[PDB]
Design an enzyme around this catalytic site. Structure first.
Site, PDB file in Angstrom:
ATOM      1  N   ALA A 139      15.872  68.527 112.743  1.00 58.28           N
ATOM      2  CA  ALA A 139      15.762  67.244 113.413  1.00 58.28           C
ATOM      3  C   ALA A 139      16.235  66.091 112.520  1.00 58.28           C
ATOM      4  O   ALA A 139      16.089  66.135 111.300  1.00 58.28           O
ATOM      5  CB  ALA A 139      14.326  66.996 113.859  1.00 58.28           C
ATOM      6  N   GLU A 174      14.064  78.503 118.151  1.00 59.73           N
ATOM      7  CA  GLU A 174      13.342  78.706 116.887  1.00 59.73           C
ATOM      8  C   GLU A 174      12.078  79.525 117.128  1.00 59.73           C
ATOM      9  O   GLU A 174      11.098  79.025 117.655  1.00 59.73           O
ATOM     10  CB  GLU A 174      13.000  77.372 116.225  1.00 59.73           C
ATOM     11  CG  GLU A 174      14.220  76.542 115.863  1.00 59.73           C
ATOM     12  CD  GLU A 174      13.896  75.462 114.873  1.00 59.73           C
ATOM     13  OE1 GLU A 174      12.710  75.054 114.835  1.00 59.73           O
ATOM     14  OE2 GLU A 174      14.819  75.056 114.153  1.00 59.73           O
TER      15      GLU A 174
HETATM   16  C1  LIG Z   1      13.859  72.709 109.579  1.00 64.97           C
HETATM   17  C2  LIG Z   1      13.261  73.884 110.325  1.00 64.97           C
HETATM   18  N1  LIG Z   1      14.349  74.630 110.819  1.00 64.97           N
HETATM   19  P1  LIG Z   1      12.343  73.107 111.688  1.00 64.97           P
HETATM   20  O1  LIG Z   1      11.294  72.142 111.091  1.00 64.97           O
HETATM   21  O2  LIG Z   1      11.540  74.198 112.469  1.00 64.97           O
HETATM   22  C3  LIG Z   1      13.464  72.130 112.730  1.00 64.97           C
HETATM   23  C4  LIG Z   1      12.790  71.039 113.504  1.00 64.97           C
HETATM   24  C5  LIG Z   1      13.652  70.706 114.710  1.00 64.97           C
HETATM   25  C6  LIG Z   1      12.567  69.829 112.610  1.00 64.97           C
HETATM   26  O3  LIG Z   1      13.382  69.568 111.742  1.00 64.97           O
HETATM   27  O4  LIG Z   1      11.578  69.151 112.838  1.00 64.97           O
HETATM   28 ZN   LIG Z   2       9.539  73.350 112.207  1.00 69.84          ZN
END
Ligand SMILES: C[C@H](N)P(=O)(O)C[C@H](C)C(=O)O
Ligand SMILES: [Zn+2]
Length: 251
Positions: free
Chosen positions: A101, A165
């Protein structure tokens, strides 16, 4: 019985368990408090206190032992920025846009989101292993009974803006998580769905021998929003991070 009035400032739409935080709708209040370590075994992974408590209840219920580890909980703005920029360098722009994100658009900055993984000595921090089998799937199937939802499903990529995810779970609170499970809703879908139920046509959640729960949406006024609640109830109010409030009344 006696009804009581709750008066809310517009900025309170940016606080609560039901915030929709995504590319469209940034976090506007960074002032998360009540953060505590999720587990004695992982002191550096923080979550909101009530959320940490729920996680422990689920781990207890499924007898997880040490088979599931928290990989990432609360992240500050600097942490999220470092992850994003580091991924640009390591993984490239396309991957990063799909799996990280934007800073100030991550649920991890709320204390309501956790990444979980199988307990193995080497775990990928960005994409940890949390399969749809065994103990991890026991967690995934129990989660909506306790307030958690798997945030990013393969069939919702076009509306979440994030790739599938397996590992990322978001606390929204019961019974919202269950209603989302029953309807196959992403949080985006639930945020729209509930706006169909105003105070004069509340949503009714009921099962077996526990009390009924009513849920309704209240649009925010430009200044003060007025909500009425029975003194004769346990209740919750959350902003949706966009335009109003969701009220949960336990009968
Ligand atoms: C960074 C990890 N892949 P996540 O935290 O599961 C991604 C998520 C969309 C975020 O960056 O908040
Ligand atoms: Zn996450």
């Amino acid at each position: 019985g006696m009804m009581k009035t709750i008066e809310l400032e517009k900025e309170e739409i940016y606080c609560g368990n039901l915030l929709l935080v995504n590319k469209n709708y940034p976090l506007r209040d960074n002032n998360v408090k009540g953060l505590v370590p999720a587990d004695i075994r992982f002191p550096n992974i923080l979550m909101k206190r009530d959320v940490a408590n729920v996680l422990q209840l689920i781990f207890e219920k499924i007898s997880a032992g040490n088979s599931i580890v928290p990989v990432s909980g609360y992240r500050s703005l600097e942490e999220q920025t470092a992850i994003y920029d580091g991924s640009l360098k390591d993984n490239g722009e396309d991957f990063t846009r799909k799996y990280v994100a934007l800073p100030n658009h991550s649920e991890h900055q709320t204390g309501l989101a956790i990444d979980l993984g199988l307990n193995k000595k080497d775990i990928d921090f960005i994409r940890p292993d949390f399969p749809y089998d065994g103990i991890c799937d026991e967690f995934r199937r129990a989660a909506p009974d306790y307030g958690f939802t798997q945030r990013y499903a393969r069939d919702k990529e076009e509306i979440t803006g994030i790739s599938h995810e397996p590992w990322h779970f978001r606390y929204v609170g019961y019974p919202h998580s269950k209603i989302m499970q029953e309807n196959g809703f992403s949080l985006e879908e639930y945020t729209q769905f509930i706006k169909a139920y105003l105070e004069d046509n509340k949503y009714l959640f009921e099962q077996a021998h526990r009390a009924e729960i009513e849920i309704y949406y209240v649009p925010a006024k430009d200044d003060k929003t007025l909500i009425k609640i029975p003194e004769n109830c346990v209740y919750q109010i959350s902003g949706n991070n966009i335009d109003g409030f969701v009220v949960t009344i336990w009968r």
